[PDB]
Design an enzyme around this catalytic site. Structure first.
Site, PDB file in Angstrom:
ATOM      1  N   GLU A  57       0.797  -1.217   0.000  1.00  0.00           N
ATOM      2  CA  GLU A  57       0.000   0.000   0.000  1.00  0.00           C
ATOM      3  C   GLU A  57       0.834   1.272   0.000  1.00  0.00           C
ATOM      4  OE1 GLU A  57      -1.584  -0.511   3.819  1.00  0.00           O
ATOM      5  OE2 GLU A  57      -2.901  -2.196   3.352  1.00  0.00           O
TER       6      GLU A  57
ATOM      7  N   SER B 172      -7.637  -5.881  -0.487  1.00  0.00           N
ATOM      8  CA  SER B 172      -6.681  -6.895  -0.899  1.00  0.00           C
ATOM      9  C   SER B 172      -6.029  -6.473  -2.214  1.00  0.00           C
ATOM     10  CB  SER B 172      -7.359  -8.256  -1.052  1.00  0.00           C
ATOM     11  OG  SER B 172      -8.361  -8.220  -2.053  1.00  0.00           O
TER      12      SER B 172
ATOM     13  N   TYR C  60      -4.203  -0.298 -13.704  1.00  0.00           N
ATOM     14  CA  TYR C  60      -4.595  -0.042 -15.090  1.00  0.00           C
ATOM     15  C   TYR C  60      -3.569   0.801 -15.840  1.00  0.00           C
ATOM     16  CZ  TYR C  60      -9.260  -2.017 -14.389  1.00  0.00           C
ATOM     17  OH  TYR C  60     -10.315  -2.865 -14.139  1.00  0.00           O
TER      18      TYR C  60
ATOM     19  N   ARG D 196     -17.363   6.414  -0.655  1.00  0.00           N
ATOM     20  CA  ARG D 196     -17.591   6.247  -2.088  1.00  0.00           C
ATOM     21  C   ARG D 196     -18.379   4.965  -2.315  1.00  0.00           C
ATOM     22  NH1 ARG D 196     -13.244   4.147  -3.854  1.00  0.00           N
ATOM     23  NH2 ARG D 196     -14.382   2.211  -4.299  1.00  0.00           N
TER      24      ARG D 196
ATOM     25  N   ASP E 223     -20.325   2.378  -4.973  1.00  0.00           N
ATOM     26  CA  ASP E 223     -20.214   1.938  -6.356  1.00  0.00           C
ATOM     27  C   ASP E 223     -21.419   1.089  -6.745  1.00  0.00           C
ATOM     28  OD1 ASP E 223     -17.679   3.115  -6.034  1.00  0.00           O
ATOM     29  OD2 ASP E 223     -16.778   1.182  -5.520  1.00  0.00           O
TER      30      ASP E 223
ATOM     31  N   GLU F  42     -20.258  -1.971  -3.530  1.00  0.00           N
ATOM     32  CA  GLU F  42     -19.560  -1.778  -2.267  1.00  0.00           C
ATOM     33  C   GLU F  42     -19.661  -0.311  -1.883  1.00  0.00           C
ATOM     34  OE1 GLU F  42     -17.284  -3.417  -4.738  1.00  0.00           O
ATOM     35  OE2 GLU F  42     -17.043  -1.516  -5.800  1.00  0.00           O
TER      36      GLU F  42
ATOM     37  N   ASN G  23     -16.863   2.365   0.097  1.00  0.00           N
ATOM     38  CA  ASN G  23     -15.473   2.462   0.519  1.00  0.00           C
ATOM     39  C   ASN G  23     -15.339   3.602   1.518  1.00  0.00           C
ATOM     40  OD1 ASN G  23     -12.354   2.936   0.222  1.00  0.00           O
ATOM     41  ND2 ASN G  23     -12.783   1.039  -0.899  1.00  0.00           N
TER      42      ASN G  23
ATOM     43  N   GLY H 219      -9.509   6.873  -2.534  1.00  0.00           N
ATOM     44  CA  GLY H 219      -8.270   7.557  -2.849  1.00  0.00           C
ATOM     45  C   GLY H 219      -8.359   9.062  -2.717  1.00  0.00           C
TER      46      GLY H 219
END
Lengths: 314, 338
Positions: free
Chosen positions: B16, B173, B240, B279, B281, B294, B296, B300
């Site tokens: 991380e 993860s 990505y 956040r 989704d 989910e 969060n 970020g």
């Protein structure tokens, strides 16, 4: 016929929990010692106890307010929020320390009676309808009715609980519960019998019943124990089936005690599950273990070894 | 609106640290541009030295010994010694499990320290995708059917069908999402998702669009859409290659759909008892239905991250967003019980 353990027994907590926690810690220390294990006594306030302190702890059963090497497991002989909110379990998880009972997430979810009852329903376990304050007069009368129970969502039991007999008592009871917690539950009262199911590892213990003289709400507020309870075998088996479902749904570990209301039509209503049920010889889960042939010392050892094996497989 | 003393906490486990360090440096500069006194704190070493902060801000690096502890700040004291006295709030510029599993929040609570984002119970529930999806349904928020591995062929056939998505259960993860098209592809994907020992989720795949909703305190931010590439699924934790994904804020959505995604995100945020920001989704199918994936608690905090883009679309710059998150954490600490 099994290798002896070095167990640190943790007890104490906040002032309102100490008397129950100290009594349990002393009993657990003596029980594991009679089984031949090495036991260290740790108070959450003072830390590790010396020979003089431990001698008075085991005698008077009271205590006023980098050396844990070789300790195989921490036996959490705590009571209430100190052992239930999950802070200590998360701290011990960080250090690789082994402990007894459920982990941080499982403990915290079970202490949140609101969230726990959501998970009861998602697991197909019936539970009485409830609202969280604030709730309008129409919501309360439509979904709950009277009489109903008002209690803090996360602050142990008994403390701050009261019965609401009419709309005129709702706001006073919410204010009373609000003096002890940030969130307040409004739960429908279910008349019936008080039933409890202990779970040890992956098996349900014999069902027990708690008899205060009556089944109405005066008895619930103004509160013998029968193991095994006098229940039709199908009802006892269903309480055991649901307790195991609750245990797995909350992802608990080691042991737990689930409370049910049994109404006159024979349907079980799950109240809550305790990840830290009292651990004295006469407590509810040890009583249930005794009805399965498991003594108090063997119960404490099994719980120690379950916590060890959980820390291994993490 | 008095200026704050903020400790920006970054670091975490080795997997991380890169993105966490990039976030920490950006948050430090953003809060410094807003007039606050800011301190850099590494989870593995505490308060940074002069040369260490220079390298943190200039090249976004802070290499740490191989035997370093990703959480040395709590097992002690690194959090109170020296200039860290008088710190109003700790900004958690972390990524992954170190900031999501609730351990840090629980010990910060025990120390009486103020910090940003959700508490230890709320963070832990949201990180468990299975538990969170149970709570989505309890809150009346639709979510795709799912089973936990292992699942029989009959269970998968009648409850999920193909295609389905195999994914690790815990947010934070490093294992990615993998789409499975047949029974034969199932077990190799489950094995590849449980390499590191956590639960594996099998979630029914929802054809349609990928949308995400940031929440700041009690305000739903403009909806964003993530435009993908091939026959795959978007992964909120995959790096990505550049140009692979395109993000649109505000998403080109029918207004009733975007408004509904915003309403559902706030319900989710409240349902899991989150705080500060989050956040949420969704998958948006061809019938206009939103399926929650989910939420969060530690999205970020960089210029290229999703929530800062949502905030910017609402006229909220990155420094203002960082300051507001700080003040929300301070307000929650001042309102704590006892």
């Amino acid at each position: 016929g099994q290798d002896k353990l070095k167990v640190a027994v943790l007890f104490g907590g906040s002032s309102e929990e100490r008397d129950v926690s100290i009594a349990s810690g002393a009993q657990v220390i003596q029980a594991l010692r009679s089984a031949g294990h090495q036991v260290l006594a740790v108070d959450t306030a003072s830390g590790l106890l010396g020979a003089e302190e431990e001698r008075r702890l085991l005698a008077s059963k009271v205590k006023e307010v980098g050396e844990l090497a070789g300790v195989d497991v921490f036996f959490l002989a705590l009571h209430g929020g100190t052992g239930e909110d999950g802070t200590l379990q998360a701290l011990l998880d960080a250090g690789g320390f082994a402990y007894t009972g459920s982990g941080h997430l499982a403990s915290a979810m079970a202490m949140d009676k609101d969230v726990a009852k959501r998970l009861f329903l998602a697991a197909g376990v019936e539970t009485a309808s409830w609202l969280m304050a604030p709730a309008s007069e129409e919501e309360v009368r439509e979904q709950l009715g009277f009489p109903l129970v008002v209690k803090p969502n996360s602050q142990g039991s008994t403390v701050g609980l009261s019965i609401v007999h009419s709309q005129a008592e709702l706001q006073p009871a919410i204010e009373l519960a609000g003096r002890y917690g940030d969130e307040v539950m409004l739960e429908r009262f279910v008349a019936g019998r008080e039933v409890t199911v202990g779970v040890l590892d992956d098996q349900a213990l014999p069902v027990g019943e708690i008899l205060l003289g009556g089944q109405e709400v005066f008895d619930y507020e103004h509160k013998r124990e029968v193991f095994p309870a006098d229940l039709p075998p199908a009802i006892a088996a269903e309480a055991q089936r649901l307790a195991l479902k609750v245990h797995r749904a909350l992802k608990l570990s080691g042991y737990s005690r689930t409370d049910f209301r049994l109404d006159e039509q024979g349907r079980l209503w799950c109240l809550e599950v305790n990840t830290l049920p009292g651990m004295t010889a006469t407590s509810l889960l040890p009583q249930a273990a005794a009805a399965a042939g498991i003594g108090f010392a063997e119960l404490c050892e099994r719980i120690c070894r379950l916590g060890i094996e959980r820390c291994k497989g993490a």
